[PDB]
């Protein structure tokens, strides 16, 4: 590991504070602006939709990425949630209610065994089965996010290869002639400190860089900074043009 | 099918000639600027790397999307061909020599066998086993490209689901918050008429539009028009912003 305190400027300039963690797969070397915060554990919030998808697919709770989960007819504050969804759109729009039903069908016992099986975070599902990743006892750090994402990339998680391919398809966020990003955002508000996540990796012709960032998020006005700050660290380190 | 000659303006502006074919999956309706050229069968050229990849993967010639295929040391006119590749990069750069090695190991019989199962074009592989899609007898029209792609999208081709998922990953071309494009380019130069291809689909939240276009290509200077003209039609039809 190598600490690069010059990156703190990227958070300072937007009157913010947070951590970005990078991992060079080819060289097996990591980088962060803050070794301390890189190992501090936060609620995963909607970043939990990755393992939640893996478990639901492997158990048959979700048949495939085409299965439609109909809106329950309850009007919610986020308009894009008030409609039918499949796996791709449910993760694109971070549709909490869809994944809360997943959790209720997966059940306490199978969820716990799988998270220990994944070595995910502190592997503690204490709380309510349908919201513990939002206000329960589960916690995970940025460096731990990267360890989990690296296994997903290599199809090393203890679920089928098919489940890992579908979830990685669902994680597709951005793609052009220069790079491919697969990631998931997160926004934790029910427990202090309020933070936003962005975890995933960038695929190049001859390498993959894994990343995991979290930052203070006192208001929803700053959510766009999750991607904005991350990409700047990538540009600075010459990972993306 | 419905003919929309107003699209011809997009070809005329760039002193070009060609066809674009679109298919609305939800509504099971097709649209094109030239019904006749839409059903005209040409050499597939590098669009053939879709079926070829499916065959190589299903037969074990290709293990997975990470397997490395060494450069043979022959300096060729296209710089990106003079290096090592995997399935992802081999298609991104239309690396002919990599896929000719696939064909040689697939063999004449198994290739003919598979294309019949795919109902691909005229199913005629006459010529060299490793160049028939470049200067052999195989022929396929734009409408037939879409019919074949529709089976791939729905995992209905007679190869494993795994093979079809991998090829759909390797077809990834562009992705943003508004759409995803999985497609493949083509460039037929060895036999007249010289044309360029672009075939695939654009994934939206609530629908999928399949597309297949070809145009006259007397010189390599106009290759970039394949994507440009297609997108102008997509913008006009309000499919992409
Ligand atoms: O960005 C996210 O991951 C996410 C997930 C759930 C809810 C929200 C959210 C909640 C309230 C306002 N704006 C966004 C964001
Ligand atoms: O764009 C293509 O699909 C493609 C495929 C194979 C070869 C070529 C090509 C051929 C000659 C010069 N420049 C590019 C283009
Ligand atoms: Cl993909």
UniProtKB/Swiss-Prot annotation, chains A, B:
<keyword id="KW-0046">Antibiotic resistance</keyword>
<dbReference type="GO" id="GO:0008800">
    <property type="term" value="F:beta-lactamase activity"/>
</dbReference>
<dbReference type="GO" id="GO:0017001">
    <property type="term" value="P:antibiotic catabolic process"/>
</dbReference>
<comment type="similarity">
    <text>Belongs to the class-D beta-lactamase family.</text>
</comment>
<keyword id="KW-0378">Hydrolase</keyword>
<protein>
    <recommendedName>
        <fullName>Beta-lactamase OXA-48</fullName>
        <ecNumber>3.5.2.6</ecNumber>
    </recommendedName>
</protein>
<feature type="binding site">
    <location>
        <position position="46"/>
    </location>
    <ligand>
        <name>a beta-lactam</name>
    </ligand>
</feature>
<comment type="function">
    <text>Class D beta-lactamase which confers resistance to the beta-lactam antibiotics, including amoxicillin, and moderate resistance to cephalosporins and carbapenems such as cephalothin and imipenem; in the DH10B strain of E.coli. Acts via hydrolysis of the beta-lactam ring. Has oxacillin-, cephalothin- and imipenem-hydrolyzing activities.</text>
</comment>
<dbReference type="InterPro" id="IPR002137">
    <property type="entry name" value="Beta-lactam_class-D_AS"/>
</dbReference>
<feature type="active site" description="Acyl-ester intermediate">
    <location>
        <position position="46"/>
    </location>
</feature>
<feature type="binding site">
    <location>
        <position position="94"/>
    </location>
    <ligand>
        <name>a beta-lactam</name>
    </ligand>
</feature>
<feature type="modified residue" description="N6-carboxylysine">
    <location>
        <position position="49"/>
    </location>
</feature>
<dbReference type="InterPro" id="IPR012338">
    <property type="entry name" value="Beta-lactam/transpept-like"/>
</dbReference>
<keyword id="KW-0732">Signal</keyword>
<dbReference type="InterPro" id="IPR001460">
    <property type="entry name" value="PCN-bd_Tpept"/>
</dbReference>
<keyword id="KW-0614">Plasmid</keyword>
<dbReference type="GO" id="GO:0008658">
    <property type="term" value="F:penicillin binding"/>
</dbReference>
<feature type="binding site">
    <location>
        <position position="226"/>
    </location>
    <ligand>
        <name>a beta-lactam</name>
    </ligand>
</feature>
<dbReference type="GO" id="GO:0071555">
    <property type="term" value="P:cell wall organization"/>
</dbReference>
<comment type="subunit">
    <text>Monomer. Dimer.</text>
</comment>
<dbReference type="Pfam" id="PF00905">
    <property type="entry name" value="Transpeptidase"/>
</dbReference>
<dbReference type="InterPro" id="IPR050515">
    <property type="entry name" value="Bact_Transpept/Beta-Lactamase"/>
</dbReference>
<feature type="binding site">
    <location>
        <position position="49"/>
    </location>
    <ligand>
        <name>a beta-lactam</name>
    </ligand>
</feature>
<dbReference type="GO" id="GO:0046677">
    <property type="term" value="P:response to antibiotic"/>
</dbReference>
<dbReference type="GO" id="GO:0005886">
    <property type="term" value="C:plasma membrane"/>
</dbReference>
